[PDB]
Amino acid sequence: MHAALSTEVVHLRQRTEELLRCNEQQAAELETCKEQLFQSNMERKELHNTVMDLRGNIRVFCRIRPPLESEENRMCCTWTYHDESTVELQSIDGQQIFSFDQVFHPLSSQSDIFEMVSPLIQSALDGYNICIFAYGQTGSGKTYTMDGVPESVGVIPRTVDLLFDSIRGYRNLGWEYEIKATFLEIYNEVLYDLLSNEQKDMEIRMAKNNKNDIYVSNITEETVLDPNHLRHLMHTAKMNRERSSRSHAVTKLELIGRHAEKQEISVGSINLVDLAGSESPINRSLSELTNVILALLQKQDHIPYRNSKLTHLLMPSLGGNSKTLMFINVSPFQDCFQESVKSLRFAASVNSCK
Amino acid sequence: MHAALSTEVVHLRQRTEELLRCNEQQAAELETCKEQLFQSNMERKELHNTVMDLRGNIRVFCRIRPPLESEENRMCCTWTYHDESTVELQSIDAMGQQIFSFDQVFHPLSSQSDIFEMVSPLIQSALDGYNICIFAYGQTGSGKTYTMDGVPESVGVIPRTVDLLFDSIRGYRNGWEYEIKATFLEIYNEVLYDLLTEETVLDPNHLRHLMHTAKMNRASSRSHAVTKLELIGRHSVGSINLVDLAGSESPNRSLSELTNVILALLQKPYRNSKLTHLLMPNSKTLMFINVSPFQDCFQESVKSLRFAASVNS
Ligand SMILES: Nc1ncnc2c1ncn2[C@@H]1O[C@H](COP(=O)(O)OP(=O)(O)O)[C@@H](O)[C@H]1O
Ligand SMILES: Nc1ncnc2c1ncn2[C@@H]1O[C@H](COP(=O)(O)OP(=O)(O)O)[C@@H](O)[C@H]1O
Ligand SMILES: [Mg+2]
Ligand SMILES: [Mg+2]
Numbered sequence: 001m002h003a004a005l006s007t008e009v010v011h012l013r014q015r016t017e018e019l020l021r022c023n024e025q026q027a028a029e030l031e032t033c034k035e036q037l038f039q040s041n042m043e044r045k046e047l048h049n050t051v052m053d054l055r056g057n058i059r060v061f062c063r064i065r066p067p068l069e070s071e072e073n074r075m076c077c078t079w080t081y082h083d084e085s086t087v088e089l090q091s092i093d094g095q096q097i098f099s100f101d102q103v104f105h106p107l108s109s110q111s112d113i114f115e116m117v118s119p120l121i122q123s124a125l126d127g128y129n130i131c132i133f134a135y136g137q138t139g140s141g142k143t144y145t146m147d148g149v150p151e152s153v154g155v156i157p158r159t160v161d162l163l164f165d166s167i168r169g170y171r172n173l174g175w176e177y178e179i180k181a182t183f184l185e186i187y188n189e190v191l192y193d194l195l196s197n198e199q200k201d202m203e204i205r206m207a208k209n210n211k212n213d214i215y216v217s218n219i220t221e222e223t224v225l226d227p228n229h230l231r232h233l234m235h236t237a238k239m240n241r242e243r244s245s246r247s248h249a250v251t252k253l254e255l256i257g258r259h260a261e262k263q264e265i266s267v268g269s270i271n272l273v274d275l276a277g278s279e280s281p282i283n284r285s286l287s288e289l290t291n292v293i294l295a296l297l298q299k300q301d302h303i304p305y306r307n308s309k310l311t312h313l314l315m316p317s318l319g320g321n322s323k324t325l326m327f328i329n330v331s332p333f334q335d336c337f338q339e340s341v342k343s344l345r346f347a348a349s350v351n352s353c354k
Numbered sequence: 355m356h357a358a359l360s361t362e363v364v365h366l367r368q369r370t371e372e373l374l375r376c377n378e379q380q381a382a383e384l385e386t387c388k389e390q391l392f393q394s395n396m397e398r399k400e401l402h403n404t405v406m407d408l409r410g411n412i413r414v415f416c417r418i419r420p421p422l423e424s425e426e427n428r429m430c431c432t433w434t435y436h437d438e439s440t441v442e443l444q445s446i447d448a449m450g451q452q453i454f455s456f457d458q459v460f461h462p463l464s465s466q467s468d469i470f471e472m473v474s475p476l477i478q479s480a481l482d483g484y485n486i487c488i489f490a491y492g493q494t495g496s497g498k499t500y501t502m503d504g505v506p507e508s509v510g511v512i513p514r515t516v517d518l519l520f521d522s523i524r525g526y527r528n529g530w531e532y533e534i535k536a537t538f539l540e541i542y543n544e545v546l547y548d549l550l551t552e553e554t555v556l557d558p559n560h561l562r563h564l565m566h567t568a569k570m571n572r573a574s575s576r577s578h579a580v581t582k583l584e585l586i587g588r589h590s591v592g593s594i595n596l597v598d599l600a601g602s603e604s605p606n607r608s609l610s611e612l613t614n615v616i617l618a619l620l621q622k623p624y625r626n627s628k629l630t631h632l633l634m635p636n637s638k639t640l641m642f643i644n645v646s647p648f649q650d651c652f653q654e655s656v657k658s659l660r661f662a663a664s665v666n667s
Contacts, residue, residue, distance in 0.1 A: 005359050012366035019373045026380040033387045040394045043438065047401035054408045172390045 034174075038262060041173060045126045049321075052123055058296065058324040059101040060350050061116060062087055064332050065141040066106035076332040077340070081105065089344075091337045098344045099351055106332065110148055113327070114158045120323055121162050124255050124268035125170070125177070129317035131271045131324045135346070137339045138245045138277040141329030146274045147238070156251060156272050160234075163253070164227050174261050179224040180254040182216070183237040186276075187247045189284055189309050194237040194249075195220035204312045213316045246282055248310055249274040271317050279339055285310035290346060292318060293326070297353035326350075403475045406457055412620065413457045414662055415472065416441060416643040419497040420462035429649040435459065443656070446649045454659045455666065462647065466504055470514040476638055477515050480585055480592040481522055481532070485637040487595045491661075492644030493654045494575060494601035501642055502579075502598040503569060512581060512596045513565065519583075519594075520558045530589050536561065537582035538568040541608065544628050552584075576600040578608065578629050595633060602661075603654050616665060641665065 064087075067076065078090040081103065088097040104112060120130045132155055134142035148154025167177045183194040184202075191202045200218045207213035224230045241249065250273050257266035275289075276282045288308035295303050296318060305315040318324065328347060330340050406413050418441075421428055434442040434453075442453035458472055476486045488511065490498035504510025523532045534556075538549035549568035555561055572579060583594035600606050611627035618624075625631030643662040645655045 002356060002359070005356075005363055008363050009359060009366060012363065012370055016366060016369055016373065019370070019377055023373060023377050023380060026377065026384060030380060030384055030387065033384065033391060037387060037391045037394060040391060040398060044394055044398040044401065047398060047405055050405050051401055051408070054405070172386055173394075 034261070037173060048119075048122060048126065049128070052119065052323055056101060057322070058293065058326070058350075059116075060326045060328065060347050061102050061104060061113075062098070062100045062328050062330065062344070062347065063104040063108065063113070063141055063145065064106055064330045065144065067332060074333040074335065077334050077337050079332060087344075089337070089340060092334055096341055096344070098347045100328075100347055110152045110154055110158070113145065114155060116325060117155055117159065118162055120325065121159055121166065121270070123323055124253075124270050125163075125166055125257065125266070127257070127266040127268045129269045129271070129322040131273065131314060131317045131322065133273045133275055133324070133326045134329060135275050135278060135326060136329035136343045137279040137331065137336065139336070140331045140340075140343070142274050142277075142327075145327055145329055146272060157234075159253070159270065159272065160227065160230055163255075170257065174259050175257045175266070176260070178256045178258070179230075180252075180256065181222045181224055181230065181233055182219055182252045182254075183233070184216075184219065184250050184252075185241065185247050186250065186285060186309055186313075187243065191216070191219075191309060191313075193219050194240045195222065195233060197240075204309065214313065216313075245277045248276045248282075248285060250310075250313060269317055271314055273314075278343055280342070284308050290349075293324070294349055294353060297350065399471070402457075411638045412665070413638075413640045414643065414665055415458045415460065415469075415640070416454070416456045416645065416659070416662065417460040417464060417469065417497050417501060418462050418645050418647055419500070421647060425648075430647045431649045431652045431655070433647060435461075443652070443659075445652050451656075451660050451663055454663050456643070456662065466501075466508045466510055466514070469501060470511050473511055473515070473640060474518060476640060477518050477594065478522055479638055480583075480594045481519075481526065481587070481590060483590055483592045485593045485595070485635045487597065487633055487635050487637065487639035488642075489597045489599060489639070490642045490644060491599055491602060492642075492658055493603045493646065493651060495651070496644035496646050496658075498598050498642070498644050499575070501644060502596060513562075515583075515594060515596070516558070516561050516565070526587065530587050532585060532587040532590075534561075535582075535584040535586075536564065537580075537584070538564070539580050540572060541578040541580070541629055542576075544608075546628070549579075552582075576606060580629070580632060595635075597629075597633070602658055613661060620665065620667060 064079065067074065075092060077092060080088045080090075082088060082097065085102060086097065086099045087103045088095060090096065102116065117132060120132075124130050132146070134145045136142055144154065146154050146156055148157065163179065167179075170177055185192040185194055191204075193200070193202065196219075202216050202218050205215045205217060207215045222229075222233055224233075237251070250271060252272070253270045255266075255268050255270070259265070276286060278286065285308040288304065288311045292303055292305060292311045303319070305311045305318070311318070316322070328343050330336075330343055418433065421430065429446060431446055432444045434444070436442065436453070437455075437459075439457060439459055440453065440455050441459040444452065460469060473488065476488070480486050488502075490502045492498050500510065502510050502512050504513060526532060533554055535552050535554050537552050540547045540549060549571050550564065553564065568581075577600055579598040581596040583596070585592045585594065599612070600609055602609060608627045608629050612630060615624055615627065615630045641662070643658050645651075645658055
């Protein structure tokens, strides 16, 4: 029937028009709602950075680890908690008393450490560069603090979990993030790619599009596909890892946020560093690191970032906007007393610079 | 013909279903977008509270009122906003402070709800144990009373606190109970009048009554309406103080002395005033700066803003 179809047409043209009109309203609500979300996040980002700056752009923390079941009779020096931020030790045989942004004691969980770190993962997604360092003599807690242990995982694994949850969320704002992972060791001034097997030679060079950012030649830079992929690379890296005690390990995650609708990008790094041991027998990098950090604090003209591989590697995450956490790991025992004191005296130098 | 318009109906069945799916994805996107916007704005407000906590015990907000029903003919000065917290006004006829930074600047279209939203945080602090002073400053005509008390149709801050403040306490009685010594008083010329003599409260509606009492029982408007709300709790001593002040315009010694007194505190001198003693606040205080958008209130606004600025020092 022709009248049937003539009717269906006339009816579809009515419908088609009410939809076309409705879709134009939705679109126009979307456009402004899209605009107010972008701006609101811009504002949330700035309020966040301000809270980080008020707490301090570089912050030092202490963590005395528990004793080991193994040696239930290494004598521990006398530890005394003057407050939540101040700590003192005495040898068994002046006063050794040190202030920090926070002191973590032997029953502080991994979770508790991460609480100091998780806010900075956001700073990295907002486009800032972050350094988390673990410092102190061998035995003192560094590896346990950064990598940790399957039963109680450390900073790095927690960072990854938060990174994927956070990235999932960001899609709802139009941001498509991409992580670039790299793992490397540093020994006697030479870099080693822990994702490679071939022995190759890698130098640190100025970037393509920013003379202040850094570029490492001939390193494996993996674009993470999902957590499973990262999990694999993590595992792999641990595999290729008294040399280990004198090697610095740097895990780096470069967050690369593209917002196509607005054509803005947001790139921030995370630099997770299991430093080498602070014990007197590193000769170059570890000493230069400590100078570089202290110089930052004193607001000095020029800074010898290029006097060492490590300070060169981390240069774009040490000046200016970057934020920096430093976890001083310490062993409670008496035979570590003098070395523990050396460790803690960097805390003294740090806040000696105000 | 049968061929022709059978082609047509198919083509339209496509555009129809095609547009319906696109209407569908839009619908969803919008629902998502609004959720996220809500969520982003909440985090923003929580950070904004943190920032004000960590940097001092004294917040300053500025509210510009919209022109009144009966004032379409009135000439407005030019208002320029740079930030959520930065505002500038220029005279209409084309040296010194002309652009001011506060903790928040509220537009003429700011609801009584949005204003209170920013004070909410300080209320719960009082339960926690602190003394809160909420001042309203400005020239007569500006917004002090409207903002503080409000009007039966769109309630102000003083009432709104009550709502939240009970929402709070039912949460606390869940091994903690709270007594609420209330207080209401005015100040004309150094004279300590009443408005009811403190009266302990035991009900949500009980307030709204004596709240309604003092209101009508109150009054020209060149007098301070203080309103203590002392709170104690036993298993948390504290207070809330809410103040609508006398006009800030040209002659009120108490105000010029209120000013003097605050230069001292921020600078870490009383009570030369009467209000100043009464309010002896370890105490988070907030201040509203009400301002009129009109060109004949220009210099007076600049008086208020420049005063608000010095406060931020
Ligand atoms: N917070 C802690 N809780 C329990 N065990 C810890 C803690 N910190 C370190 N350890 C243990 O102490 C030892 C110290 O080595 P580790 O800190 O992992 O590397 P490094 O000694 O090079 O800093 C490890 O065997 C680890 O099991
Ligand atoms: N945000 C606002 N929205 C609408 N009207 C307002 C607003 N603020 C003040 N007004 C009106 O402007 C007038 C100014 O008086 P008001 O500010 O309430 O008392 P005071 O001048 O003592 O501060 C009132 O009539 C009030 O209703
Ligand atoms: Mg180690
Ligand atoms: Mg009034």
